[PDB]
Amino acid sequence: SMMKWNRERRRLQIEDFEARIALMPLFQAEKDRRVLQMLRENLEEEAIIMKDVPDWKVGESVFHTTRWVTPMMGELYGLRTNEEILSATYGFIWYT
Amino acid sequence: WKPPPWNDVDPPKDTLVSNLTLNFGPQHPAAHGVLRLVMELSGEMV
């Protein structure tokens, strides 16, 4: 009985997984727009605040290469609230 | 300083074990209330 039930669950899992596969396009596009838009907000905020710094020209590439690097979470959410920081870093981690 | 013993078996000191005289009873429920059974034990072994 269990081997039939377990076999059924595997069919259910791959069916559930297949839904996620179809859901990746919209999700990837939405996260793609969100992450770089929010980076631009950071860069815009950098160029209202670093104007008086003796040596600060905005948009410095800390990495020497021109290849895109996935944005580290520090420069992403660093200029947000405490709720945004907490709900993003450990939001999944806590979630009892 | 003393040169080491030739057999390398340095002499064992005094006994470092005891037989743990235990005063079983009388308040002990197993002691029937009035037993002063006192035994010698090497661990659980008596």
Binding site: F17, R20, V35, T70, P71, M72, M73, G74, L76, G78, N82, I85, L86, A88, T89, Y90, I93 | -
Partner: protein
């Protein structure tokens, strides 16, 4: 607060370490160490290392240190050497509470602490990476590779453990 929560858990980890490192009573040293053992798991949990975090609870808190209590119950030096018994242990405990209090303040002010290594005192949350793990827990898939790619480690770890039991009985047999 929750801004620098992992700053906290790391701090009790240090003071917990200073506890037993100050050479207090072996049970009390065990108490201080398991306190560090308990708080250290939270540090790993905050990073998503649930499986690794839960293990140290299992095989290090409920594992090694339990049989440590046996030797403490076996040693039983004629008097407890709890913190009040000696004054050097107080000095060791008191001292170990200073420099880590010094450098956190050093790191909290300008963050340019250069003890041995250069170190940033910025919030713990920063170094985290952003990205979904899908359905596969990265911690789980890593450990489960024990039987996929960690074949060679499995043999050596198993063989040493087998040799681990042959030595223990042989040394303890007392000829």
């Amino acid at each position: 607060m929750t801004m620098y929560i992992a700053f906290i858990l790391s701090t009790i980890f240090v003071i917990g370490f200073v506890g037993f490192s100050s050479k207090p009573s072996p049970i009390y040293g065990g108490l201080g160490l398991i306190v560090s053992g308990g708080v250290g798991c939270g540090i790993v949990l905050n990073f998503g290392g649930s499986f690794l975090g839960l293990m140290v609870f299992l095989i290090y808190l409920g594992g090694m240190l339990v049989v440590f209590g046996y030797t403490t119950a076996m040693a039983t030096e004629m008097y407890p050497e709890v913190w009040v018994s000696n004054k050097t242990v107080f000095g060791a405990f008191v001292s170990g509470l200073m420099m880590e209090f010094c450098m956190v303040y050093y790191a909290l002010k300008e963050e340019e602490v250069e003890i041995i290594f250069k170190f940033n005192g910025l919030g713990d949350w920063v170094i985290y990476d952003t990205g979904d793990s899908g359905f596969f827990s990265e911690e789980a898939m890593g450990i489960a590779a024990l039987y996929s790619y960690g074949t060679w480690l499995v043999i050596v770890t198993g063989w040493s453990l087998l040799i681990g039991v042959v030595v223990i009985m042989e040394i303890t047999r007392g000829n």
